[PDB]
Design a protein around this nucleic acid. Structure first.
Ligand SMILES: [Zn+2]
Lengths: 82, 231
DNA sequence: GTAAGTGATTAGAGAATTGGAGAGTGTGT
């Protein structure tokens, strides 16, 4: 079997890779908010495609939102916020 | 009871190209015409070498008779060794320079080798039909190899044969596949498939290890800018 | 009113039940 899980979400393909992807993104606050949202959403899709290619972007983000409740991911976020 | 030491045979073949000569008609020196033709291929003024086996037979070189007999008896194998020795000679002539780009496959190869940059890797990644882009042909004039259509039988399979005849029918020139190139959708890797005979079967599923482990199910799409065709 | 102690609630871990995907193997054209 194969499934997206906490090892992958905390691994080198995970949240740190998403942070490194987001370092170059700098929206203009005076522009259209829906246009800025579209620009952000496809960077989410790009990171999800690299991180787990089997699944749709919608299901990937649902699975990440589910896996945020795990204690291992919470401990990772506590360390990562420093 | 078979010989498969290809390096020694390559040494013999290269010694033939180095040491065959014809005297100049004014007596001013010697011409080495086979290596002149090799340098014409290296500077891309040419596309093929025609080798005469009787010149090999009557050359003043050790093991010349044995080399000629081996060429005649397993000609389909010795073509590869001749191509390899001519490729090594071309690289020795050329050095750190580059051969000129003239067609789309040349442009693709020159661009992609330096994309790969940015010999084991080269020989593993690319098949030799794609790395080498010239033709080698053999000839005979001695009457031992003269036969009719009627006499070519089971003893002649795999051998070099010479004959003389009349042409009844001829087709027009068509493009024939020699090497197919495929690219994956998801992981952007490439597959090179050489073709032998009058049929081939295309592969379906991507073989690259990261794509296979991720189960990304990427299809393979064939590309004719990288694929090789021949008249 | 403030400080200390004890009780209760909440969070985590372990164990058991239910279900569905995937791969292998057998049969029919
Ligand atoms: Zn692939």
């Amino acid at each position: 079997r194969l499934a997206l899980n906490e090892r992958i979400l905390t691994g080198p393909k995970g949240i740190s890779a998403l942070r490194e992807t987001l370092k170059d993104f700098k929206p203009n606050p005076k522009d259209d908010p829906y246009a800025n949202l579209e620009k952000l959403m496809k960077k989410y899709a790009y990171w999800g495609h690299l991180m787990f290619p089997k699944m749709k972007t919608e299901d990937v983000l649902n699975r990440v939102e589910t896996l945020g409740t795990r204690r291992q991911v919470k401990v990772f976020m506590i360390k990562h916020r420093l | 009871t078979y010989n498969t030491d290809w390096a020694a045979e390559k040494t013999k073949i290269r010694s033939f190209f180095d040491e065959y000569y014809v005297d100049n008609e004014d007596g001013s020196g010697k011409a080495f015409p086979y290596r002149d033709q090799v340098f014409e291929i290296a500077r891309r003024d040419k596309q093929a070498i025609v080798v005469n086996v009787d010149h090999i037979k009557e050359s003043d070189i050790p093991d010349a008779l044995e080399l000629s007999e081996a060429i005649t008896s397993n000609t389909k194998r010795y073509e590869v060794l001749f191509k390899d020795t001519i490729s090594d000679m071309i690289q020795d002539y050329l050095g750190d320079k580059q051969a000129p780009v003239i067609d789309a496959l040349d442009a693709y190869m020159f661009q992609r080798l330096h994309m790969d940059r940015n010999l084991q890797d080269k020989r593993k990644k690319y098949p030799p039909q794609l790395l080498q882009r010239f033709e080698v042909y053999f000839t005979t004039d001695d009457a031992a190899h003269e036969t009719c259509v009627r006499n070519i039988k089971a003893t002649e399979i795999g051998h070099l044969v010479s004959m003389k005849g009349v042409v009844i029918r001829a087709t027009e020139v068509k493009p024939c596949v020699e090497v197919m190139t495929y690219t994956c959708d998801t992981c952007a890797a490439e597959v090179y498939q050489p073709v032998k005979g009058m049929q081939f079967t295309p592969p379906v599923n991507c073989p690259n290890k990261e794509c296979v482990e991720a189960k990304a199910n990427g299809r393979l799409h064939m590309q004719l800018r990288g694929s090789k065709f021949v008249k």
